[PDB]
């Protein structure tokens, strides 16, 4: 692999996801593929569909082979079923050759291909245990590590809030400055990591740390927002309201049913608090914090040319605390499967109007935190 060649290999933005161009089959068909650290299947549109331009036609690839079974994936808010096959795939930027991988071609779906998306397949980069129909269906990244002789590590930078980069097989030094901090992967399915504390404007939420991990705290590039369990979400909304210099937001704003609008260049950014998430260091005596500024969670959206409107970048969850694109837009994130850890560095690209919109710092002591914040 050539990591430098992978810089800027993603297109897209937060609300719509970040995608990689992949060439599938013989002769190659080019698809736009969502980079998803929250699932473990390589799956592409197999038919025309609303909201997509293009799909992979198996009949036009001479190297495609059908496994003779299908797969159905069900999420909380959507589903799809596809035929499972194998074919050769090329990633134009960082590699010299094609590779043989599993692929699901979607022939039916519910609430999966959405308005506004520019992708027509997904690349699940999570662990084998999440793969469907079972963990024996070799994942794309397991194929790539095995066939391309790369290290079992990839890293991602999202630059939309300021395209992006997906560096398969390592870390690209040009994508960060300052230090990389690593937190252990607690459980290898999703990228589940341990959250010790959330802090709003320097004020810790007063919750038992198990509240942050009971469902599971995961890092997921395929989720747009920062999703917080209801109790945690309520506490965050209360603290942001308390901390705003002048009250600006209705209840409808906090739930996503209203926009907050200001006349062009009147947004009082200095009014709103930083939000920090504390993660355990590999040395359990220490933690570090990843911090997002208001510009990352008070998110620009389309009132007409005279106003700038904004939607809240955090939402309630049912089943996980999801560190989605809202937060990943601030950091270079290293998914170090080989060493069972997730790394973070501030993204130099996460700057607006000459100011960083994220920070990372440490170390902090964990002596006043339970030794395990994942329920036991």
């Amino acid at each position, epitope marked *: 692999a050539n990591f430098l060649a992978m810089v800027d290999n993603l297109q897209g933005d937060s609300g719509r996801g970040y995608y990689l161009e992949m060439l599938i089959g013989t002769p190659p068909q080019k698809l736009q593929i969502l980079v998803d650290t929250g699932s473990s299947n390589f799956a592409v549109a197999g038919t025309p569909h609303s909201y997509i331009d293009t799909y992979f036609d198996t009949e036009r690839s001479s190297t495609y082979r059908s496994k003779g079974f299908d797969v159905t994936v069900k999420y909380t808010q959507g589903s799809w079923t596809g035929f499972v096959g194998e074919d050769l795939v090329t990633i134009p930027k960082g590699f010299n050759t094609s*590779f043989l991988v599993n692929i699901a071609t979607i022939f039916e779906s519910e609430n999966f291909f959405l308005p506004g998306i520019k992708w027509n397949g997904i690349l699940g980069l999570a662990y084998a245990t999440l793969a469907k129909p079972s963990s024996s269906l070799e994942t794309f990244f397991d194929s790539l590590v095995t066939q391309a002789n790369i290290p079992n590590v990839f890293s991602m930078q999202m630059c939309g809030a300021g395209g992006g980069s997906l560096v398969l097989g390592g870390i690209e030094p040009s994508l960060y400055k300052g230090d990389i901090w690593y937190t252990p992967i607690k459980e290898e399915w999703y990228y589940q990591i341990e959250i010790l504390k959330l802090e709003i404007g320097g004020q810790s939420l007063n919750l038992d740390c198990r509240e942050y991990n009971a469902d599971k705290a995961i890092v997921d590039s395929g989720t747009t927002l920062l999703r917080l369990p209801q109790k945690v979400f309520d506490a965050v909304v209360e603290a942001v309201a308390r901390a705003s210099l002048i009250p600006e937001f209705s209840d409808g704003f906090w739930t996503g049913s209203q926009l907050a609008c200001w006349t062009n260049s009147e947004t009082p950014w200095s009014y709103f608090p930083k939000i920090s998430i504390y993660l355990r260091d590999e040395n359990s005596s220490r933690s570090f914090r990843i911090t997002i500024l208001p510009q990352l969670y008070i998110q620009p959206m389309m009132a007409g040319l005279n106003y700038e409107c904004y939607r809240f970048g955090i939402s309630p969850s049912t089943n996980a605390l999801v560190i989605g694109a809202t937060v990943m837009e601030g950091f270079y994130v290293i998914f170090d499967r080989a060493q069972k850890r997730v790394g973070f560095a501030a993204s130099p690209c996460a700057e607006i109007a000459g100011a960083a919109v994220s920070e990372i710092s440490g170390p902090f002591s964990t002596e006043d935190v339970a030794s395990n914040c994942v329920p036991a």
Partner: nanobody
Amino acid sequence: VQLQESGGGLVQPGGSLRLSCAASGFTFSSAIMTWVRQAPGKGREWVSTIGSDGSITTYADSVKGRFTISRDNARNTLYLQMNSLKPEDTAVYYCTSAGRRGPGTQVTVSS
């Protein structure tokens, strides 16, 4: 999932071996299968991959024409036929699928 390699040995330059990998605990007829090799002090080196129905095969340039991958789905076995062996081919050879690997079989090529 269980993979078990056998068939390695100590051969002279220009010799041959037939490696086997016995698979169990999964549907072998639906698995992409791969051979990799690693010698002490060197990085892991991909050798060859075969799709599940055996029709698609890929090889490292370092082994192309000398090694041939094959499988017998009905017998849950992956093979590597190795001809024209060279000292540089000395390594532990492992068969892998879905992130799992066997314990490996040693191939040593020496005069």
